[PDB]
Design a protein around this ligand. Sequence first.
Ligand SMILES: *[C@@H]1O[C@H](CO)[C@@H](O)[C@H](O)[C@H]1NC(C)=O
Ligand SMILES: *[C@@H]1O[C@H](CO)[C@@H](O)[C@H](O)[C@H]1NC(C)=O
Ligand SMILES: *[C@@H]1O[C@H](CO)[C@@H](O)[C@H](O)[C@H]1NC(C)=O
Lengths: 49, 48
Amino acid sequence: SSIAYSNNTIAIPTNFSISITTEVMPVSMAKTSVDCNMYICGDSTECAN
Amino acid sequence: IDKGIYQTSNFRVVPSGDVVRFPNITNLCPFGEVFNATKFPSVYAWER
Ligand SMILES: *[C@@H]1O[C@H](CO)[C@@H](O)[C@H](O)[C@H]1NC(C)=O
Ligand SMILES: *[C@@H]1O[C@H](CO)[C@@H](O)[C@H](O)[C@H]1NC(C)=O
Ligand SMILES: *[C@@H]1O[C@H](CO)[C@@H](O)[C@H](O)[C@H]1NC(C)=O
């Protein structure tokens, strides 16, 4: 593009347009918890020791 | 302790009983002839 720079000319709008623009944002994760003693040992009593 | 909700333990249900399953069993051994055939051999006729 080429803005025609002028020492004494100005461009002024004669008309306008309304617009609607979507903006999308994340706010939270899935709340999670882990029973580590079951995850590690699977109800092996000796692993639990 | 102050007002709130607190984590204290992981609970876990223990089993009430035990189950064993094996195949639909068949083919018994021919042992009954060795013990209770009708008149046993001599030490020379000796069934094995
Ligand atoms: C502005 O542009 C729209 C495009 O649909 C047109 O209908 C309208 O007449 C224009 N308005 C003016 C004031 O020039
Ligand atoms: C084998 O399965 C059949 C069908 O359920 C049943 O009638 C039979 O008693 C079973 N036998 C054994 C040895 O489990
Ligand atoms: C044969 O049958 C009799 C039934 O009383 C039993 O006592 C005996 O032990 C069986 N076997 C032999 C080796 O005789």
